[PDB]
Amino acid sequence: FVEMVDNLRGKSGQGYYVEMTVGSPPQTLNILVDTGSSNFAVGAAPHPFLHRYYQRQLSSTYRDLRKGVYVPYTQGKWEGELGTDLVSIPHGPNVTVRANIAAITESDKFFINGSNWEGILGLAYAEIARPDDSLEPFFDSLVKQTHVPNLFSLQLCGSVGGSMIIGGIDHSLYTGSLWYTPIRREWYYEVIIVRVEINGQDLKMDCKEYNYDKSIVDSGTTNLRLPKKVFEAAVKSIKAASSTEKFPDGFWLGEQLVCNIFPVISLYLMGEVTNQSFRITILPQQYLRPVDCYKFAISQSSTGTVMGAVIMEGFYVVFDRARKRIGFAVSACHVHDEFRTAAVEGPFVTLDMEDCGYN
């Protein structure tokens, strides 16, 4: 998978993108890699922010599905026209598939001014695909039409770079062993957090609170998002551990910037075996992001835990769809100092892990 190494690019806070081609003859586009959605949607109109866009008139293999799609988010929205066309990934497997494409004709607060991507690749499951689950996501189409194994892995490195290994695992991209957590449900990449530690000190919360209403792995989100009750207990512990320096309350809420003291954060994830778990540990270098101006990149959430770039940049993450599991291993590219490094450790004994999942 050497040709797939270093196939991700981007700028800080603007996400990670991969080069893709769409149509015949192939039209080159930069496409954001997003494990938190399920639509393959591309700019198809000359929006001022876009370097380029999908021109359906130039493609002889384009097929109109004669259906519109309106996708609103919490922050922004896009509207598109649904169709199918031939899609390939130049720095991926040597294959071409017919995939669903939402041609974006109208948007608000979706594209980033100054970014180098013009589309989004939803890598999650059909259940959260829009308008409904009958619209087959790209990766489902890829696995069905080719002999590409039902697996992909992401190494996101902290302008920015990384690797999306499609159909396999590159062992040079991680150190130590991979540790797997079950995918609870095939919609988002939903996982179960069973324990949270700040500098080794347990938060002592009902583990159901950590997964209210869900916990997901999302490459399209920057922050580690936590449920508000978990966030408040987490921040209080981080404040106590970093009592050497005094910071304004706005900094902790992400309302202001600040220009060894900060604690490590450990998330225990449900293991593959009954009563067995493992832990992933991140550093201040992950959750305190440069904007020297630093932004506290842990925030409160209404939609449950989001393991965004803050988590993913510390680890090599394997999305093992074939076995309904997500693998975590220490990333060979993660940012650390001489005293502390990111870690994946196990096994640990954790009882009543099924009670941690919200129903």
Ligand SMILES: Cc1noc(C)c1[C@@H]1C[C@@](C)(c2ccc(F)cc2F)N=C(N)S1
């Ligand atoms: C859900 C949700 N609610 O508010 C926001 C913002 C989202 C993001 C939606 C999406 C599609 C997204 C990501 C990056 C980007 F640049 C634009 C996007 F639209 N992927 C996610 N994972 S989170």
